[PDB]
Structures are given as structure tokens and as C-alpha cells.
Amino acid sequence: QDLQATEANCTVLSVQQIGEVFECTFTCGADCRGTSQYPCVQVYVNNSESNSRALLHSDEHQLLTNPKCSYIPPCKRENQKNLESVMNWQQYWKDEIGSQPFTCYFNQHQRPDDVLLHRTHD
């Protein structure tokens, strides 16, 4: 499944303080996979193309507001330090999606890459 094209989710986390829980995903050989559970985290995009999750800090003020959110061991491929660039990130999604996560699904089993692009609705 993961080895072949099939499921790939692309969602922009929503902006919330606390009261939300998220799960992380991992992929290994021998048909073995692992997941982790952690409270609410900053805002960015979840790359479930296989088992990756990217988190970005919208601002330090949010951390002071929800310091017990990402304090738990977060799973990120890279720190991705971003300063003024972070403001542009919100402007890019805020101007298009406004603030609604989305999921995707695609499979090469057919021949190329038929993909789906469902969006989150409030």
C-alpha cells in the first residue's frame, strides 16, 4: 500500500488553542507501522504522503497562549525555522483556503496518478 501510490493526505491544520489531539504516523518494512499521540500543535500542513507531519509556529504569542500544546515531543522532519516567511504562509493559505484543512488520495495502480482533493468545510 504505502510502498505503492494510494493514499496521500494534504491538510492545512486549523488554528485553535487547546482541546484538540493529533496523531503522528511512521512507516517501516516487515509490514510494521507506528503512530504517536500528542495534544494540539502549532499550525502548518500535514504531509501524509506516507508518514510525515510538518508543523510551523504562527507566532511566539500563540506559544505563550498555548505553551502546553506542542511541548510534548512533536514529530517534524526538520525544524524549518521561519521568521517573516511565516506571515507569508498564513497570507498564502488565508487568501485561498482561508482556514480549512484538506485531504488527498491517489493511486498509480491504474497507470499514472489519479488524485483526489477533498477540502475541509466548517
From Swiss-Prot:
Entry GO MF terms: calcium-activated potassium channel activity; potassium channel regulator activity; voltage-gated monoatomic ion channel activity involved in regulation of presynaptic membrane potential
Alphabetized UniProt keyword annotations: Glycoprotein, Ion channel, Ion transport, Membrane, Phosphoprotein, Transmembrane, Transmembrane helix, Transport
PTMs per UniProt: Phosphorylated. Phosphorylation modulates its effect on KCNMA1 activation kinetics. N-glycosylated. A highly glycosylated form is promoted by KCNMA1. Glycosylation, which is not required for the interaction with KCNMA1 and subcellular location, increases protection against charybdotoxin.
Extracellular topological domain residue ranges: 1-122
Annotated coiled-coil segments of the chain: none
Topology in membrane: Multi-pass membrane protein
GO biological process, one term: potassium ion transport
Subcellular location: Membrane
Reported effect, N9A: Loss of N-glycosylation and reduced protection against charybdotoxin
Domain of life: Eukaryota
Any one of the GO CC terms: synapse
Tissue-wise expression: Predominantly expressed in brain. In brain, it is expressed in the cerebellum, cerebral cortex, medulla, spinal cord, occipital pole, frontal lobe, temporal lobe, putamen, amygdala, caudate nucleus, corpus callosum, hippocampus, substantia nigra and thalamus. Weakly or not expressed in other tissues.
Glycan attachment residues as annotated in the record: N9, N46
UniProt subunit comment: Interacts with KCNMA1 tetramer. There are probably 4 molecules of KCMNB4 per KCNMA1 tetramer. Interacts with FMR1 (via N-terminus).
Other information: Treatment with okadaic acid reduces its effect on KCNMA1.
Domains as described in the record: Resistance to charybdotoxin (CTX) toxin is mediated by the extracellular domain.
Family label: Belongs to the KCNMB (TC 8.A.14.1) family. KCNMB4 subfamily.
Function: Regulatory subunit of the calcium activated potassium KCNMA1 (maxiK) channel. Modulates the calcium sensitivity and gating kinetics of KCNMA1, thereby contributing to KCNMA1 channel diversity. Decreases the gating kinetics and calcium sensitivity of the KCNMA1 channel, but with fast deactivation kinetics. May decrease KCNMA1 channel openings at low calcium concentrations but increases channel openings at high calcium concentrations. Makes KCNMA1 channel resistant to 100 nM charybdotoxin (CTX) toxin concentrations.
Protein name: Calcium-activated potassium channel subunit beta-4
Species of provenance: Homo sapiens
